[PDB]
C-alpha cells in the first residue's frame, strides 16, 4: 500500500489591504492506495522408465524451459496484461495519453501513413518539466525511418552511406522485439493494397 | 486475493430510488456515505439527514424522524437557515463517479436520508448506501 | 470523531429487491457482499453470481452477463453442477442480522447478482450491497 | 495562406524569421518567450520536397536556447488549441491566437 498526493489547493489569493480578515482556501487530497501481487505456477509429468532409459537428460531441459517461459510471459504480461489475476499493463488499460497520425492522400484515395514529421513532432512534444524520457520501438519500425526518401530520391537520414546507424542510446531510443511492430513482419508500409492498417501501436515514450 | 470484506465494513441500503431506510449504527462506531447516480441530472439536488430513537414499545424498532443539527467546524462561512444538516449533490456529476460524505457528530441510534422538499424528481436517479467501520461488540 | 469512510472502502447497491445492478470493481482489488433481509422469509433462497466484460463499443458500459465459475478449495466436498458461483441464504434468518460472503477468484470487470429461478418471489424482501477495498484505480 | 481557393490562416517559418529580425536594434538585445508546442511546430516544418527546414537529417532539432535567445514557458496561450491539435491544412489554426512575444 502507498499514498499518492492527488493535488494541492489554493490559499493565497490577492485581497485588499484595508481589512482585518482573510479567506479560508480549500485543502488538497491524499488518496491512500494499495496493490497486490499475482502468482505463476504449473506442473508437468515425466515417466520413470522412459526418462531413466532415455537418450539423454530431459529433466534439466524442462527447468530451462520453465525459467524462460516465465521470463518471456512475465514481460509479455507486464506490457499488455489484462487486469484479471495479471499485472495491469500500460498498453491495454488506455491510461496513457495516446496520439494518432492523420492519413495522407494517394491517387485521390486516402491511406494511413507514418511520415518523418510525426516521429520528430512526437518525441519533441513532451513536457520538458518531467525530465528526460526514453522511447521504445520495434526494430522493423526503426528500419522504416531509416529507408525514407524525399520527392527527388535522396535519403532523409544519412544521405549517401547505405546505412544510417545513429548510435541509438544517444537519442533516447531502446529497440525491443516485443512491440506490435505495425509493419506486419517487415511489409505493411505501402501505398496500395499494403495500407498501414490504421490503429496499430507504433512507439511509446515515457520517463 | 480478496478478503471477506463483508465481516467488517458492512453496508446497507439507505435510499434506493424512492424509499428511505433506517440503518442501525448502534454497535458500529464510525460511518460515512457513498453517493452514486444512475443517470444524468437536471438541476441541483439536496437531501435531509435525520435520526431516530428506539421506540418505547420495542427498543429495536424505528421511532419518529428527527433531524440532525449541523455542528460547524472551524472555517465555516455559511450555516443552513435552520442550522440542520443537509447534503447537496452538485450539478454536473456524471453517473460513473462516486461521492463520499458523513456527519461529524453522531447522535441517536440509526441514520436515515430523505430528499429535501421540491427536489424529489432527481432523487429517483440517485442511489445512496451506508458503510460502517467498527464493531464494539 | 467518525472518519469519512466513504472514500477508503465505498459501497454500492447490487440487488435492491427489484432489479440487479452491475457495480464496477476494476479500480479495486477486494470486494465482498453483505446480505440483509427486510421481512420474514419462507424458504431457502439462493442467488446466482454473474461477472461482466467491457463492451466492444464502449469500455465504460456492461456487455453480456457471463456466469462466474465456481472454484473449490481444500475441503470443498459438495460442489454443484459443473461449477457456478451460487450463494444460498439459509432459512431462520430474521431481520437486523446480516450475513456476508464473497467469491475467492475475481474475473472480468464487474459483478452482478440476480435471484435464481425459484427464489425470485422471496428475493423481493432482501437487499445485497458490495463494499470494495482500497486499490490504486 | 490560400489552399485550393480556401483562405486559411497559417504560420510559416518564413514569418517567424521575419518577425525576430524586425526588432529596432537601437533598443538592444531582446529575448523571445513562447509555449513549448510552438517550438515543436517550427522544428517539424517541411519544404516542398520532403526535407526539414531545420536540422537536415538528424531526427531531432535541439539547439541551445541561450545563443538562440528563446525562453520557453508551458502556460502561454499555446496557439495550438489543445496539445498539438492545430496546424493542418483545413480545420486548424483559429485566427487571432497569440503565438510568441519578444521584448527587452
Amino acid at each position: 500500500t502507498y499514498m499518492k498526493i492527488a493535488d494541492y489547493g489554493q490559499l493565497g489569493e490577492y485581497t485588499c489591504d484595508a481589512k482585518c480578515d482573510a479567506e479560508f482556501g480549500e485543502p488538497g487530497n491524499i488518496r491512500h492506495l494499495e496493490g497486490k501481487t499475482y502468482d505463476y505456477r504449473g506442473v508437468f509429468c515425466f515417466n520413470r522408465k522412459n526418462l531413466q532409459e532415455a537418450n539423454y537428460d530431459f529433466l534439466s531441459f524442462m527447468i530451462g524451459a520453465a525459467q524462460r517461459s516465465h521470463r518471456i510471459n512475465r514481460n509479455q504480461a507486464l506490457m499488455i496484461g489484462k487486469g484479471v489475476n495479471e499485472p495491469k499493463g500500460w498498453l491495454t488499460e488506455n491510461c496513457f495519453p495516446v496520439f494518432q497520425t492523420l492519413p495522407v492522400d494517394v491517387n485521390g484515395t486516402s491511406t494511413p501513413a507514418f511520415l518523418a514529421q510525426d516521429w520528430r513532432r512526437f518525441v519533441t512534444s513532451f513536457p520538458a518539466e518531467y525530465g528526460e524520457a526514453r522511447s521504445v520501438m520495434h526494430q522493423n519500425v526503426f528500419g522504416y525511418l531509416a529507408a525514407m526518401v524525399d520527392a527527388n530520391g535522396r535519403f532523409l537520414f544519412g544521405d549517401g552511406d547505405l546505412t544510417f546507424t545513429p548510435d541509438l542510446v544517444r537519442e533516447r531510443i531502446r529497440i525491443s522485439n516485443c512491440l506490435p511492430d505495425p509493419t506486419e513482419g517487415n511489409t505493411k508500409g505501402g501505398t496500395g493494397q499494403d495500407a498501414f492498417a490504421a490503429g496499430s501501436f507504433v512507439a511509446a515514450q515515457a520517463a | 486475493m480478496n478478503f471477506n470484506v463483508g465481516v467488517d465494513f458492512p453496508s446497507f441500503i439507505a435510499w434506493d430510488g424512492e424509499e428511505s431506510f433506517p440503518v442501525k449504527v448502534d454497535g458500529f462506531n464510525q460511518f460515512g456515505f457513498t453517493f452514486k447516480t444512475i443517470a444524468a441530472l437536471t438541476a441541483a439536488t439536496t437531501f435531509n439527514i435525520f435520526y431516530h430513537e428506539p421506540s418505547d414499545a420495542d427498543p429495536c424498532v424505528p421511532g419518529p424522524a428527527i433531524r440532525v443539527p449541523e455542528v460547524p467546524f472551524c472555517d465555516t462561512v455559511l450555516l443552513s437557515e435552520d442550522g440542520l444538516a443537509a447534503v447537496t449533490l452538485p450539478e454536473t456529476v456524471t453517473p460513473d463517479s462516486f461521492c463520499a460524505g458523513t456527519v461529524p457528530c453522531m447522535n441517536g441510534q440509526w441514520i436515515s436520508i430523505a430528499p429535501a422538499t421540491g427536489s424529489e424528481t432527481n432523487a429517483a436517479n440517485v442511489q445512496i448506501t451506508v458503510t460502517m467501520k467498527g464493531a464494539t461488540r | 470523531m467518525n472518519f469519512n469512510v466513504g472514500v477508503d472502502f465505498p459501497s454500492f447497491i447490487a440487488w435492491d429487491g427489484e432489479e440487479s445492478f452491475p457495480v464496477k470493481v476494476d479500480g479495486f482489488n477486494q470486494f465482498g457482499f453483505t446480505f440483509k433481509t427486510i421481512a420474514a422469509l419462507t424458504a431457502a433462497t439462493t442467488f446466482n453470481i454473474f461477472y461482466h466484460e467491457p463492451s466492444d463499443a464502449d469500455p465504460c458500459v456492461p456487455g453480456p452477463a457471463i456466469r462466474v465459475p465456481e472454484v473449490p478449495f481444500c475441503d470443498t466436498v459438495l460442489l454443484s453442477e459443473d461449477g457456478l458461483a451460487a450463494v444460498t441464504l439459509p432459512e431462520t434468518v430474521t431481520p437486523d442480522s446480516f450475513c456476508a460472503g464473497t467469491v475467492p477468484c475475481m474475473n472480468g470487470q464487474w459483478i452482478s447478482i440476480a435471484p435464481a429461478t425459484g427464489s425470485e418471489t422471496n428475493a423481493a424482501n432482501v437487499q445485497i450491497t458490495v463494499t470494495m477495498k482500497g486499490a490504486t484505480r | 495562406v490560400d489552399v485550393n481557393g480556401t483562405s486559411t490562416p497559417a504560420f510559416l517559418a518564413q514569418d517567424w524569421r521575419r518577425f525576430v529580425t524586425s526588432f529596432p536594434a537601437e533598443y538592444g538585445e531582446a529575448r523571445s518567450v513562447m509555449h513549448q508546442n510552438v517550438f515543436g511546430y517550427l522544428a517539424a516544418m517541411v519544404d516542398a520536397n520532403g526535407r526539414f527546414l531545420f536540422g537536415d537529417g538528424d531526427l531531432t532539432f535541439t539547439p541551445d536556447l541561450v545563443r538562440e535567445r528563446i525562453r520557453i514557458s508551458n502556460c502561454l496561450p499555446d496557439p495550438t488549441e489543445g496539445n498539438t491539435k492545430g496546424g493542418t491544412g483545413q480545420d486548424a489554426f483559429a485566427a487571432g491566437s497569440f503565438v510568441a512575444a519578444q521584448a527587452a
Binding site: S125 | S97 | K24, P59 | D2, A10, D47
Partner: peptide, 28 residues
C-alpha cells in the same frame, strides 16, 4: 457540515490527432 469527496470510476479513452505543419506552399 458535510465535506463531499468525489472521484470518477472509469476514465474515458482519449485520442489526440498529432497534426503537423503542411508542406510549404507559395503565397501567390
Amino acid at each position: 457540515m458535510v465535506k463531499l469527496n468525489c472521484r470518477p470510476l472509469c476514465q474515458a479513452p482519449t485520442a489526440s490527432r498529432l497534426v503537423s505543419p503542411p508542406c510549404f506552399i507559395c503565397r501567390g
